[PDB]
Amino acid sequence: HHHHHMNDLVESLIYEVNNMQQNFENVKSQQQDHDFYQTVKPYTEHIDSILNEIKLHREFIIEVPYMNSRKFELLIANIEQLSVECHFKRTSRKLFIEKLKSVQYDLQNILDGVT
Numbered sequence: 001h002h003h004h005h006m007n008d009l010v011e012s013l014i015y016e017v018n019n020m021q022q023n024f025e026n027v028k029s030q031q032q033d034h035d036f037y038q039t040v041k042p043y044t045e046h047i048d049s050i051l052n053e054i055k056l057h058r059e060f061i062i063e064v065p066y067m068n069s070r071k072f073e074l075l076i077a078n079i080e081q082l083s084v085e086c087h088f089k090r091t092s093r094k095l096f097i098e099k100l101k102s103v104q105y106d107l108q109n110i111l112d113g114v115t
């Protein structure tokens with residue numbers, strides 16, 4: 001409900017989802033998984049912190065155009081999943097990039113809505 005904070009939260013996830021794309025590109029070129037405890041755990045926990053905040057604004061966000069309760073829950077899960085998958089060389093490019101595009105698509109609609 002407080003939307004310059006929501007703005008920054010959403011812009012924060014946008015930045016982070018872009019970062020996830022670069023991480024995926026790095027594990028793929030390098031053909032090496034990132035270290036679970038030194039890289040993956042801390043990263044996914046930092047993503048969880050942002051998501052925990054954005055969940056506090058659930059009631060507002062679900063009411064913006066293009067959003068609803070179900071779509072909000074899938075968006076969160078999709079972002080969590082990407083935050084992990086981007087660290088694995090075996091992650092499918094086809095499925096990862098499709099899910100990333102879908103997440104950036106939702107995030108933009110939210111950004112428009114909270115603005």
Ligand SMILES: [Cl-]
Nearest residue numbers: 068069070071
């Ligand atoms: Cl629904």
Ligand SMILES: [Cl-]
Nearest residue numbers: 068069070071
């Ligand atoms: Cl739906």
Ligand SMILES: [Cl-]
Nearest residue numbers: 014104107108
């Ligand atoms: Cl985006």
